[PDB]
Structures are given as structure tokens and as C-alpha cells.
Design a protein around this nucleic acid. Structure first.
Ligand SMILES: [Mg+2]
Ligand SMILES: [Mg+2]
Ligand SMILES: [Mg+2]
Ligand SMILES: [Mg+2]
Ligand SMILES: [Mg+2]
Ligand SMILES: [Mg+2]
Ligand SMILES: [Mg+2]
Ligand SMILES: [Mg+2]
Ligand SMILES: [Mg+2]
Ligand SMILES: [Mg+2]
Ligand SMILES: [Mg+2]
Ligand SMILES: [Mg+2]
Ligand SMILES: [Mg+2]
Ligand SMILES: [Mg+2]
Ligand SMILES: [Mg+2]
Ligand SMILES: [Mg+2]
Ligand SMILES: [Mg+2]
Ligand SMILES: [Mg+2]
Ligand SMILES: [Mg+2]
Ligand SMILES: [Mg+2]
Ligand SMILES: [Mg+2]
Ligand SMILES: [Mg+2]
Lengths: 100, 152, 208
RNA sequence: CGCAAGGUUAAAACUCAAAUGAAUUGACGGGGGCCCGCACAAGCGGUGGAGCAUGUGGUUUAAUUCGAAGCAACGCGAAGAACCUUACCUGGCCUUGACAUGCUGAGAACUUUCCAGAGAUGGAUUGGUGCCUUCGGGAACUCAGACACAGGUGCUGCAUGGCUGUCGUCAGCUCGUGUCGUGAGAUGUUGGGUUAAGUCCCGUAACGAGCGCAACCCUUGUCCUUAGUUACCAGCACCUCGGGUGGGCACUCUAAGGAGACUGCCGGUGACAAACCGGAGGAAGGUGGGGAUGACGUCAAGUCAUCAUGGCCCUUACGGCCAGGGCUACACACGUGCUACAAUGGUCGGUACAAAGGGUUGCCAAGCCGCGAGGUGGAGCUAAUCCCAUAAAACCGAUCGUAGUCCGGAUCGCAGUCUGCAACUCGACUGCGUGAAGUCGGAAUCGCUAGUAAUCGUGAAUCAGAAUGUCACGGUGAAUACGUU
RNA sequence: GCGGGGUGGAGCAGCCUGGUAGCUCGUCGGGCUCAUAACCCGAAGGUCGUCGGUUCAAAUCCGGCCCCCGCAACCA
RNA sequence: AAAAUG
């Protein structure tokens, strides 16, 4: 959880979000059955133009306080070993211990 | 259990015959909770018994269990240096359990088309005693006289 | 063995959550992040003031913060030139507008967080820990406090081996859910490492 | 002295800082006595044999990145390694730096649609000179320089905090005052019963108290009150025969508040006590079933790699950026699993009944085109309202006839679908064809006492994709317990 | 020249009386144990000295040869 | 009935 590594994933977040439209248009044109092989191929070229650091697959979500790559809960934003610490203090609304 | 507070549940759900031993035999032949499979298999076996056997099949069944139940059972006890065996009279409730278990486990080992006619075959064999279950019963019985020395 | 957090096990039963609002699949994570950031920032900034409970409420697109402190004079100085800067800063952090209400708490020696902080800052000043434990326990027991336990762990003094000490007085039943056991932990940073302080305070039974 | 064995009298050098007696607390015993626990015993089903998944040890490699090591490591951190993750290797590329503050100068961010480069990067690139103005100026943002710095998943868990396992959910562990002993200490807390319990009763130099046990919390099983849409349909009517429609507050159901179970009543035993064994009633009877809850402490137990922190260490590098590769390697060994070795079965046809949950950077219906995984399509839904979504084992009829087979599916060849910049290393499924080991498994070893075992299916987390793993929910549904050596 | 023999890496059964090679110690792997030793269970490893003949067929029956012995004997 | 050692 080195801060350089957090910085380089946050910058990945900006790089992914800052296009947000050329990916959609190009992939929609590619997946459109009636667009001709020319618009297939130019769209492939266009997709290969932009940096690889733009896709959502490259984006590994992390804890917002520690950045632990493992043990994530996307309903919250915290990691495995901070969600419990915050919950025992009652900070998380409507969270208790369950028996049933 | 050391406490001896564990009571027993009573099961009696004979569908049509309204008997008692039949249901316990059902449970013995039931495997992995396949109760209806046991229903149809045992009832086909009993139908074959009824068509082969002139009389009703339930008294033939109880007579067959009468010839498989062991009167005495041998049980190993170690004297502290030697491996002995001791013959003891079987608990009256335990006789039916041994009878059912032996009959089922011996009907399982025939090797013919299905175990319905296997169960019929050993039900008729045990009706007088030319089967293999009666063979094991008499072997276990004769082990008692073979070890009558200790008894006490 | 280990013991469950006494505040968490009593959540809903006798204790109350420190952040009461409602959110949905989108804004829930953002609201939790804002709450955690605001709480740590407020604690760090008003460390000098004796702040214990930061209660957060969220009405429609708004936010209300109430502060439980033993010293309200520092925050409320010469008719409001302090809380307003805080309001503006919190609105810089919290997108929604904020609202502040400074709540003063009597009997600070009956609040676990304050006792823990005082003991920790005493140990930071190279004071013997047994004297601090005795003084805190006696101060707590002069008024109310049907029971109190204080535990301190670490390299007490300057020894190069860690150990744990604790002193109790009265009754502190942790296995009874009716009892509202106030509980707190804190860390004291010394030249030889970290010292952990835990405080349990028993107020009374809740009946009916 | 004695026949001999040997007896009697009896030193020193040297060497050590102890040797020793009695009693106390604990631990232990192939010492004793009571009691408990799937601990045995009585049963059911497995592992160890075969194929495959997954982790570990060892070997090789450029790396196979770290950590976890009897029970208490080995489907463990990891609730998801194609790139990223990533901490390792090869090569390329930076030096106050990807990031914080402090000084100086130039200026907007933005949008610039191009070239070289595996890429970091370097060089053109129309456009705007900004906001507010003490109109002087100023805040923010980008770049250049300079130091104080920044940085480290680098070592020490035997310097620490926090968190966790374990004995063990076993019934114990202590204190004040008093008393006994020269003291370490002891009584309380021993004893007769009884209980799941240091639970309770009676006695009693002890009298009282605290942390444990029990109770308060959640859920499940009965009933009552309120509630009736999107949930329900007993009655009435219409109906195109779909609670479909009008309609109702009957019912189920959903969710809030209450009643009820307390050895309460009767019989016997019992020191006429605690309690035990029966009976009635009751949906439930003896803490009704399950959960959460883990005392004083032990193992210098685990973690410095989630985090924080005392020290020590590098600063052109042990700090950063980018391409590929490895963590999925392979003469072997071990743990945990899935599938089988078949007839209580494998195929074919139509057929009936669940619970739980997830969905507006989402579910994705109808229709149409494909044997097929899928594709176009766009409906409904912020959801008891629409979608995921057809449960399966079970039952009836037909066939196979016990044969390594109408079993079993590994392996392999060819051709495909889908997400992803990209499926060689190294993804999941689909179609045709090929078709293995396996005939129920040695020494040894494991889990389980009633909705239990066994067996059948469904859902969620992580997640673009990837589950035989984890967590969770229902269907069918047993056998056995005389007893404590 | 008398008598006896030859088979897993070492040592014994199987011959006789024809068709079937097992056992012990070793090596390897795995069990038991907190761990080691002891102990238990698997696996590999022998076409039987060789040649010829008998014999339907041979580790087995007969001989040639070779080797081993107990050998008397030999013993610089 | 077996059980040597650290
Ligand atoms: Mg850090
Ligand atoms: Mg990903
Ligand atoms: Mg003892
Ligand atoms: Mg047993
Ligand atoms: Mg196996
Ligand atoms: Mg194996
Ligand atoms: Mg490793
Ligand atoms: Mg496990
Ligand atoms: Mg430790
Ligand atoms: Mg620790
Ligand atoms: Mg005295
Ligand atoms: Mg004592
Ligand atoms: Mg005691
Ligand atoms: Mg008690
Ligand atoms: Mg309790
Ligand atoms: Mg009763
Ligand atoms: Mg250690
Ligand atoms: Mg890389
Ligand atoms: Mg790995
Ligand atoms: Mg088949
Ligand atoms: Mg061995
Ligand atoms: Mg020795």
C-alpha cells in the first residue's frame, strides 16, 4: 500500500474517466452488425491508438483509507480490517452483529 | 452415553399393511433418504413372494426372520494380555435389528437382475434356512459353544 | 482469550450509532468516507479541546454535527469567531451544508475517552503509571461510577520487555447486555514506543 | 589381627561453592477414588486405491515475489495473478522525484486530432489569455531551478500498540476483613447430597465481595391486537374463465406490540431440605431447538505485509516509470476436495411441490435468427409490482440386461460463442469425433446422536471474465446408544 | 580322487514325485509418535550357471563344461 | 499386556 502505488492507481482512475466516450462509441460501432468492414477496421485502429491505461479492467479498486488490494466490500468503501474497526465504534449506520 | 437421558423416538407409518416390523425393514432398506424407491422395491419383492408363496407374505416374512435371529452373540473382551471372546445372550430388542440388517446385507450380495427378486430369494430361503444369512447366523451361534468356557 | 468490543455488542440494545441517516447504493460509500474524514480531521484539530462524541445527522441534502466536549469555552470564543471557520471548512469537505451545535458535558471524569486521553498524555510526560491509574480510579469513584477498570500495556517505564497492568474497582460486568459499559482506547507515544490504554466504566442497569 | 576373603586404627595433595534436613505451592506417576465430553462401545457414511481441482514440501529456472509450520500451517493472508493486481526477473527510462510544506521565474487549466519510440518520453499543434479587482494587485492551476526533504511491501512480532488462534464455552480464578502457622502459606473455595454449572440446600473460624455460570439480546415453534398494496381470495356478481374484473377485510401472508413454559398442579421418593422419577393439561416440560456471548492466564503462539510505532539501514537507489516473462514450471511426497467404478442405475416423453437473495455505470423480458454456447431487439422495473428464473432428487410409462457396457468421463484432434487493447505462455463455456484409469480400495485414519447423518438442487460476496473453494437457503430423509473396564 | 552344491543385492525354500518360484535381511515409499529408535504395510528387484540331450513341456530328469564348497590334500 | 531416549 505504498503511496506511490495509490497515486498511480488514482491517476489510472482519472485516465479511465477522462475519455469515457470514445470507448463507448468505437465499441458500439464495432458491435453494430451493419457498419461495413471499413468501419470495423478503422475502429480497431482507433481503439489501438489510445493508451492501454484507459480501460476499466486495468482499474483495481482499493480501500479509501489504506488501499489494501485484497479484502474489499464495495457496498462500503473500506477494507476488511477497517470496516470492522469502524463498525464496532458505531460509525457505520444500521450495522450490528447478526445471529438469526 | 454416560448421562443416559437419551430417549427413543417411535416410528409407525405403515402405508397399507398396518404392521410394525415392515416399517423398520423399510428404514433398513432405505438408502440416502430414498423412501419411495424402498417402497416400490420391497413391494415388488413382496408381490413376487406372494405369487410364489401360497400363503400371505407377512407370516412368511416373520418366519424368515425367526430363522435368522441369533439367540446368542459373541463379543471380544481383552483380559489384559490376551484377546478373548465372550458369549452373551442377545438383547430381545437387538434380535430384530440383527435379523433385519443381516437379511438386507445378504440380499444385497446375490448378483441377479435386481434386489427386489434378491430380497424375495433370501426371504424364501430364510423361510426355512437354506440361504447364506442363515449360514452366518448358525456360524455366529456355534462360535458361542466354541467359546462356552468363559461365559460366566 | 479475546473479548468482543463492548460497545459493538450493545449496539441497538443500549448504545446508539454515531451517524444516523439513510443512503442508497450510490451515495452510501461517499457518505461513509465523508463521515470518517470529518471525524478524524475534527479529532486531530480539536485535540487541545476535550472532544469525545461527534454525532452526525443527515437530513435531506444537509448535515448536522454535534460535539460533546468538557471545555466549550475554547470552541465558543468571544461570541463566535471559531465555530464559523469550522463550518466553512466542513462545507469545503462535505459537499452539503453543515450545522454545528457544541454540547457541553458535565462530569468529564465519568467519560471513558477523556480518562483514557488524560492517562495517555500523562504517560507521555514520563509519569509513573500506577499513580495515574490510582488517581483516575479515585476521581471516577468519588461520584457515581458503580465500577471502573483501567488497563495499560506496553514497555512501562523504560524496560525492554512489555507487560500489561490493570486496576479495577467496583463491579464491571461485561457479560450483561443491560449494562451500559462505556469503553475507550487510546495510544500514548513515548521515546520507547507505544503504550496502550483501555478504560471500562459501568454506569448502571437499564430496566424496562 | 586373619589361612584366605579381609577386618581395625587412619591421612594428605587436589577440587567445588555448595552438599544437606523438614515443610509449602504446583506439576507429574506404567498410584488411588468420583464425574464429564462422538472419547470409547453400539451404528451410518467416508479418507487412504483411480482420474481431475486446489494448497504445501522438494527439484529446476531469469524469476518461480513474500508470509503461515504438531494438535493451534497445508481450498491458509488471497471475498477472484492474461495486462493491472505485483511486492520477483530481463531490458529500456528518471534524480528534491509519482506525493506534502517552505523560496524564485514563466505563464491557465483546457482543447491542440501529427511524427519517432515495445513505452515511459521527446519534438509540431488552430484556438483562450483568464476569476475577483485596493485596478496597484491577488488566489487557483501547469512547467523550470535550489535546499531543508520526500520515499522503502528494507531488517528486528525476542523492543511494541492494536487485532487473532489455542487450552475451552471447560468451570473455574481471585480479593477485603477475621482466624491458624516462626515462615513459605492455609481457611474461606473442605464435607453429605444435587445440578449442564464454585447451581442449589444443609452443615461448618469463617463472615462478605468481584470476574466467570445463569438471566437481559437474535431467531424458530402456538395464539391475540393493529395493519390490507404491489400481498390474500371465504362469500357476491361479471368473466374472454387469467383474483382476470368489480369487491371484501374471511383467511394465508407480511411486521410491530403483547400473552404463554415458571417444576406451575397431582403421586411417590428424598435428611419431612435442594432435587429426582412419573401423571394431567398444554403447540411447546423440565436451561423447548439453534445462535451471539470466550473469566484469571498459558504457548517470548501469529502478524513490522492492512494499519501505527522505538530503533537500525539505502538516498544516481533497497527510491520511482514503462514493455515483455513468472507466481498456473515438474523425475516425486503429503493435506483438503469433486467425479466415478453402476440395475435403490444410465437414457427417452410429458409431468408436481421449495426457501433465500440480487438488480438504474443495473437486471435485461416478448419476438426473430442459430442443434448448440449465443446474436438483434427493446419491454417492465429504484422493485412483495418487472427481470435473474424452467429447481432437483422424487412419480408414471418405454428401453438397456450386468458387459470395462446404452457405466465412467480423463486425455486428445477439428470447428465455434463470449468479456477483455490483447485468450501462445495463461480464461470460461459450445458442436462433432476419440475415448483412458476405475470391478468399492493395505497398514492406518475421519465425521456424525434428529430435520442429525446421507443425498438433491438454488443464491450471494470478490468480480469485465474466471469456483469442484467460502458463506448462505430449502427438498427427501434414516440406523444406533446394554454400558464406563 | 570322495561327499555336497549353483536362483533377486546377501542368505534359505520350490527338485524329490514334471506344468505353481515363496521366505528372511537389505533398498525405496508410506504408516505410528510431539519427535527419534523399535514396530506395521506396500513396491521394485530371480526366466532358475552354462551347452546339449531326455521329456508334450523342465529351476525339476541325464550328461559335457564352468564355478562354488566340505575336502582330504596343497601350504613361500 | 506393550512403552528405550530427548
Ligand atoms: Mg506506508
Ligand atoms: Mg480486475
Ligand atoms: Mg494427581
Ligand atoms: Mg466406534
Ligand atoms: Mg486418492
Ligand atoms: Mg497417492
Ligand atoms: Mg511460497
Ligand atoms: Mg478449511
Ligand atoms: Mg508474540
Ligand atoms: Mg502482539
Ligand atoms: Mg500470626
Ligand atoms: Mg487456597
Ligand atoms: Mg480452587
Ligand atoms: Mg456463582
Ligand atoms: Mg451466558
Ligand atoms: Mg409431561
Ligand atoms: Mg515466536
Ligand atoms: Mg508490468
Ligand atoms: Mg500462487
Ligand atoms: Mg454415458
Ligand atoms: Mg519406513
Ligand atoms: Mg542415547
Amino acid at each position: 500500500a505504498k503511496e506511490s502505488m495509490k497515486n498511480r492507481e488514482l491517476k489510472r482512475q482519472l485516465t479511465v474517466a477522462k475519455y469515457a466516450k470514445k470507448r463507448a462509441e468505437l465499441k458500439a460501432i464495432i458491435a453494430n452488425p451493419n457498419s461495413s468492414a471499413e468501419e470495423r477496421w478503422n475502429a480497431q485502429v482507433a481503439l489501438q491508438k489510445q493508451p492501454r491505461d484507459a480501460s476499466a479492467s486495468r482499474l483495481r479498486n482499493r480501500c479509501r483509507l489504506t488501499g489494501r488490494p485484497h479484502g474489499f466490500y464495495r457496498k462500503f468503501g473500506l477494507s476488511r480490517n477497517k470496516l470492522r474497526e469502524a463498525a464496532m465504534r458505531g460509525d457505520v449506520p444500521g450495522l450490528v452483529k447478526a445471529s438469526w | 452415553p454416560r448421562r443416559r437421558v437419551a430417549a427413543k423416538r417411535e416410528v409407525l407409518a405403515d402405508p397399507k399393511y398396518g404392521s410394525q416390523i415392515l416399517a423398520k425393514f423399510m428404514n433398513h432398506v432405505m438408502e440416502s433418504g430414498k423412501k419411495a424407491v424402498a417402497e416400490r422395491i420391497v413391494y415388488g419383492a413382496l408381490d413376487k413372494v406372494k405369487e410364489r408363496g401360497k400363503a400371505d407374505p407377512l407370516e412368511t416374512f416373520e418366519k424368515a426372520l425367526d430363522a435368522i435371529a441369533p439367540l446368542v452373540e459373541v463379543k471380544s473382551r481383552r483380559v489384559g494380555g490376551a484377546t478373548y471372546q465372550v458369549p452373551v445372550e442377545v438383547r430381545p430388542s437387538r434380535r430384530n435389528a440383527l435379523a433385519m440388517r443381516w437379511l438386507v446385507d445378504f440380499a444385497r450380495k446375490r448378483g441377479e437382475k435386481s434386489m427386489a427378486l434378491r430380497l424375495a430369494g433370501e426371504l424364501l430361503d430364510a423361510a426355512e434356512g437354506k440361504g447364506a444369512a442363515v449360514k452366518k447366523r448358525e456360524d455366529v451361534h456355534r462360535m458361542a459353544e466354541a467359546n462356552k468356557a468363559f461365559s460366566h | 482469550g479475546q473479548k468482543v468490543h463492548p460497545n459493538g455488542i450493545r449496539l441497538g440494545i443500549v448504545k446508539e450509532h454515531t451517524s444516523v441517516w439513510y443512503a442508497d447504493r450510490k451515495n452510501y460509500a461517499d457518505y461513509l468516507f465523508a463521515d470518517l474524514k470529518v471525524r478524524e480531521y475534527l479529532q486531530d484539530k480539536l485535540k487541545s479541546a476535550s472532544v469525545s462524541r461527534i454525532d452526525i445527522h443527515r437530513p435531506a441534502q444537509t448535515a448536522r454535527i454535534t460535539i460533546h466536549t468538557a471545555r466549550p469555552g475554547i470552541v465558543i470564543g468571544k461570541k463566535g469567531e471559531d465555530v464559523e471557520k469550522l463550518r466553512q471548512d466542513l462545507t469545503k469537505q462535505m459537499g452539503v451544508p453543515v450545522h454545528i451545535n457544541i454540547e457541553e458535558i458535565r462530569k468529564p471524569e465519568l467519560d471513558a475517552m477523556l480518562v483514557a486521553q488524560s492517562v495517555a498524555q500523562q504517560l507521555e510526560r514520563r509519569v509513573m503509571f500506577r499513580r495515574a491509574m490510582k488517581r483516575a480510579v479515585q476521581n471516577a469513584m468519588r461520584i457515581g461510577a458503580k465500577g471502573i477498570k483501567i488497563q495499560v500495556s506496553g514497555r512501562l517505564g523504560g524496560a525492554e520487555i512489555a507487560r500489561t497492568e490493570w486496576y479495577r474497582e467496583g463491579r464491571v460486568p461485561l457479560h450483561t447486555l443491560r449494562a451500559d459499559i462505556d469503553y475507550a482506547t487510546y495510544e500514548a507515544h513515548t521515546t520507547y514506543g507505544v503504550i496502550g490504554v483501555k478504560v471500562w466504566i459501568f454506569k448502571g442497569e437499564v430496566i424496562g
